[PDB]
Amino acid sequence: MHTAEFLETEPTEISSVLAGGYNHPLLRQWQSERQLTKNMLIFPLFISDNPDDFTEIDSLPNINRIGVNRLKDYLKPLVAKGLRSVILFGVPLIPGTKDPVGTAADDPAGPVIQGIKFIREYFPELYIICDVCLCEYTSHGHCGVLYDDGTINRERSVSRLAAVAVNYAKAGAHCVAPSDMIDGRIRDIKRGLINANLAHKTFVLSYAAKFSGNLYGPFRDAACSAPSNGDRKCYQLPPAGRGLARRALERDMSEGADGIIVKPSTFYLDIMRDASEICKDLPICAYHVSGEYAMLHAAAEKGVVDLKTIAFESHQGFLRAGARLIITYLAPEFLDWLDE
Amino acid sequence: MHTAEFLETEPTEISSVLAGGYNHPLLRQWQSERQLTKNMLIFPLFISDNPDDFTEIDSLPNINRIGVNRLKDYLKPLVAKGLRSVILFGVPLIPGTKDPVGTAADDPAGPVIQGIKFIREYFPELYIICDVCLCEYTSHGHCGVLYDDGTINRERSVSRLAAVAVNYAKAGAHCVAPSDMIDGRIRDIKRGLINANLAHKTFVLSYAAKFSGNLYGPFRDAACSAPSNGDRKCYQLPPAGRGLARRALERDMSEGADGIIVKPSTFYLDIMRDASEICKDLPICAYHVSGEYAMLHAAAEKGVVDLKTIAFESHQGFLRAGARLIITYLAPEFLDWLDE
Amino acid sequence: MHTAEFLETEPTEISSVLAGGYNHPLLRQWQSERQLTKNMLIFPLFISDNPDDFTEIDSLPNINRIGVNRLKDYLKPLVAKGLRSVILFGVPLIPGTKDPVGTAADDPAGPVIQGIKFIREYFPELYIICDVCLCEYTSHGHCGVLYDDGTINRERSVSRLAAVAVNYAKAGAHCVAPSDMIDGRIRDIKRGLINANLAHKTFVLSYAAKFSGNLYGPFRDAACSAPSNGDRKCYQLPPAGRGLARRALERDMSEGADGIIVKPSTFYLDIMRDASEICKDLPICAYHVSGEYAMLHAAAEKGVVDLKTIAFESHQGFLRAGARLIITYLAPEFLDWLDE
Amino acid sequence: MHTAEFLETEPTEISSVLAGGYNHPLLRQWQSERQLTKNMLIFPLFISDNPDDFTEIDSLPNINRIGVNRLKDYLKPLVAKGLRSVILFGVPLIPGTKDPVGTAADDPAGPVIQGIKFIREYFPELYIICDVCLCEYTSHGHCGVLYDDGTINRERSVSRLAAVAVNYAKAGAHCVAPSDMIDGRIRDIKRGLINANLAHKTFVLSYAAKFSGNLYGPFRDAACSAPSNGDRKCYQLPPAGRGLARRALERDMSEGADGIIVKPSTFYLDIMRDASEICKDLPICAYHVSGEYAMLHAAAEKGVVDLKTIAFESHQGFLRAGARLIITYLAPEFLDWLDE
Ligand SMILES: [Zn+2]
Ligand SMILES: [Zn+2]
Ligand SMILES: [Zn+2]
Ligand SMILES: [Zn+2]
């Protein structure tokens, strides 16, 4: 007969025994270096320049493009469940708005600044973050100002972006989050806020390690920000570029970032870990991007994973890797799930 | 008129300028610290105890359960395209096989050892890795031997697992990969190989940082390994347990691991980065698990991502985070994609 | 009788046993931290100002001095076998060309810029690196502009070199590689590219740790760059000067280098290892120089080593020591050897 | 006219200026972290079991196989020029000497122990190192005792090697240098010396990081040590195996090594640098092996390099990389060159 063989053992070495630390549900919580709380959540808003908009974005589940006259009813229940922060993205749809230098990015009449004034008035305790970039405002869809050859013009771009950021701060935004990845834009934005006497009031949340890749699809629908001719690979970091990401983190810290974003999130958890050493004294934020989000919904719909389960697994992942803040389209779900 | 404002700039600081390093496609390759090659790929095989099997696994796209009489035709084209390694999982379906101590795990008549002898004869240059565990062989589906209260019995389990590993080595396997996560099993497996005069011939590839979670669904179908009563949370590591994972990596290195696996992969890239310091002198392997794989297919089917694109993005992610080996169900695709 | 004595042993300690990790050919590959691929290779070209040249260089085996009208036939088969990058060296032989300030270094009529325009037109996917220095263009053969006492004039030299580098970039070179070792030339070259709006397009590949020594003999024949009166020991680093090399690496990184070269290679592998810490976020390139190359051929011809074997041994050495790029006269051989 | 362009400069930054440190020949000496002295040199001797031998080794320039009756005349002038240490290799040519367990390795009648007694008597101040291995004594030419399948038997090999080392110590050798690379042999050799009351008298100089490769050709002629059937790749380290080398250095230190050898030398300078951290408290020795030596002679004969120049360049390389001792076939040359 084939019988079950058992090799002769030596006494257990104490160094082998890890199991005492995780044999109860409370312990598996004790083992986290950071626990998820509601105040860590940052929820993106896509604000339309049609005040009555509430448009479904087909590729971005359960997220809409919203005008100002619809914001109050949308946000009231979220704030009531403990939402503490939002990140605004403007989506100007009125024709003849977009141009080569993103003039409308800081249009006082535009959806972001209108959105800021609305939220400061109706939800004065909400912390307002504004994305800073030109892509939702340029005729060509790139994140900066271009040379004639279509490559990015660094100096003009950071000059423009610094203006936009300061103007959002002047309108009332508490935080600016430059998502452009153009060399040296943090220095100029910080200098701009210093010159405007707003640097002591305005958190600079840099998208310091933001990678090019395949996970921004549904965002392009929500924000109508797809590039015209070419792609973003000469400024967004290459997925394999750990060295570049490390240098970008150091750079933006040095140039005045109060916090940094790693983007995408799950697919770049190692870069959050890198950032947790380089930027150990700064808050680190994970951005759970449109494609990562839509991927979780697609897999859950197919029965591969359970939505709530993998949402907790992925978001706990961010905290494990060193983040303490999360920008996520699942914020409404978590404001309910974290009660229980 | 609202006009485009441009703040006054200072001269560019050289420290700001990263763009010289990634403005051409060849450079975005120069920026990787490791490039993907075919010899890094390890392909899982699910071997049936019905020699004529070639059964589709509904939840695991394009992967089948295969008996020995079908292996040659399956593997010939893969080896011809450069496959260098396989990892074997036995799936014994004959009734009255499974028992409380996983007797059949090392049945010389069983699919793993038959699979080893087949591959050594027909594909003598293929490197054979065998998964080592009891879950595919226990009546209760857990990875070790249980006490009456249903908790894991450490000493009996590692005694049994050491036997299994040595027996696979004795049959011809080049490498054993214990996936059980039971405290101290590497020491006993290594001592077992030393006593059998096989330690100088047998690579010990420990699943050192293997987490409990929501991503093993489709594997349970392929391997018929689902637990009976309870789950694996008292031995698989808690997703938030970075400290435990760090300690597990150190432990298994100390107890004789020649290499380590981090599992799952994408959702645990930060742990690969941790491992790349702790286990800097050892090969690190990412396991792209059944649920991560099925998730990529589900999202691609929904048009969220492009399959090939995100496959390269995710697998490049592993290398970026410090892995130099990848166990992946996408090995056949990559053996074609890496030619081009 | 003298008989074979065997001392009494203790049981094997697991910590002693390394052999599990390297007992199979696939494993000895798993043990490399980086594998050699074709896209890592950079091949030097010596371009003549006689368009029809294809002159053998007696001291540099299998390498010729080539004019532009012969380039297409020379490069077509190499690119077809996967060559991705070249490094250009100009060799102007027309009398009355060389002068004390290396005027011809950036002659639009000269072999480098002609070579750049030829390659951009006929091989538009090739990545073009240009050596930047004055030695192939000065009447005196030194790498910079001299004072009357014959010592290097730093300020004038870096002023001239910055111009040359920018002019090559303006002509189409993707990368400039200053090989002069004159203090602070990287800062000025980078500032020059920034002022010319080319820094976002031009990789600066500094020969940061370049040593004086006995291994440049055959290069002096190919490039007709031998100094007049004196040697290069006051700017090329002394072979024993680890401290200086460490400081040079830090300096050039700080002044804008996107990548660094260690030169020579095999005889300075320890400096590559130093560089892999100091410049961990940057690509590191080994230059397998003329004398190291000619040394391998001489020893192989004498039957001391096998050419292919020691070529792989030495080039794997570079990767082991932390390089991820290799400038090597053996590129044609490797474009064939890496297929197999 | 094409005229020499000079870009506008900024004032020199002090951080750019390294040249103050190496503008004079005395300074290029000040810049070495260690200077070459005669007492750092260790000279290999190949001792024949024919007492009157003085046989030229065709592939090893200027080195002979020497019997005991010729030793005095050979060594007298070397010691007179300051030779402080030798490393002995036995070359028994009498038929019926070699056997599967290397019985003759510690034959009191054999060339090593005769060589030890000769040198202790006639040159009592010379420091005697003995190579410890079985390859010059086994019928099959491998470095240890084999199983029937021809693979190395670890336990028997280290048992035999420990005996040999202790027996050389008992005969008068001051130092034993095990060159076998078999797992755990240092522990057993050290325990053997402790049991023999010789550990307080006997330096253990481990060849801890000894690589397989193409550079041992001429040694095989001198020592008649070429393997029978197979090669040494399952115990000598793979050239790409930095991780293994790091682990081997740590291991042998832990098991009792008083010093370590890195072998080969020039082609592994990065491993010396690794060793200088891992083994910072221990002397590190470079072995300039037969093929590296013969390579320098071949290139010098071809006029690629100047022999003396490259000998100093390479040996200074060892010291730069962290060695403080050098085993080298060029010791006679250096005992003359270091006077001047
Ligand atoms: Zn943008
Ligand atoms: Zn299991
Ligand atoms: Zn030069
Ligand atoms: Zn030996």
Curated annotation (Swiss-Prot), chains A, B, C, D:
Residues annotated as the enzyme's active site: K210, K263
Annotated positions binding 5-aminolevulinate 1: R220, R232
Positions carrying Phosphoserine: S254
Pathway(s) per entry: Porphyrin-containing compound metabolism; protoporphyrin-IX biosynthesis; coproporphyrinogen-III from 5-aminolevulinate: step 1/4
Positions contributing to Zn(2+) binding: C133, C135, C143
Keywords of the record: Heme biosynthesis, Lyase, Metal-binding, Phosphoprotein, Porphyrin biosynthesis, Zinc
SUPFAM superfamilies associated with the record: Aldolase
Regulation: Inhibited by divalent lead ions.
Alphabetical list of Pfam families matching this protein: ALAD
Bound cofactor: record note: Binds 1 zinc ion per monomer.
GO CC term (a single one): cytosol
Domain of life: Eukaryota
A biological-process GO annotation: heme biosynthetic process
EC number(s) on file: 4.2.1.24
Leftover remarks: Present with 11600 molecules/cell in log phase SD medium.
Subunit field text: Homooctamer.
Function according to Swiss-Prot or TrEMBL: Catalyzes an early step in the biosynthesis of tetrapyrroles. Binds two molecules of 5-aminolevulinate per subunit, each at a distinct site, and catalyzes their condensation to form porphobilinogen.
Family recorded in the similarity comment: Belongs to the ALAD family.
Protein name in UniProt: Delta-aminolevulinic acid dehydratase
Species per Swiss-Prot/TrEMBL record: Saccharomyces cerevisiae (strain ATCC 204508 / S288c)
Organism ancestry: Eukaryota, Fungi, Dikarya, Ascomycota, Saccharomycotina
Gene: HEM2
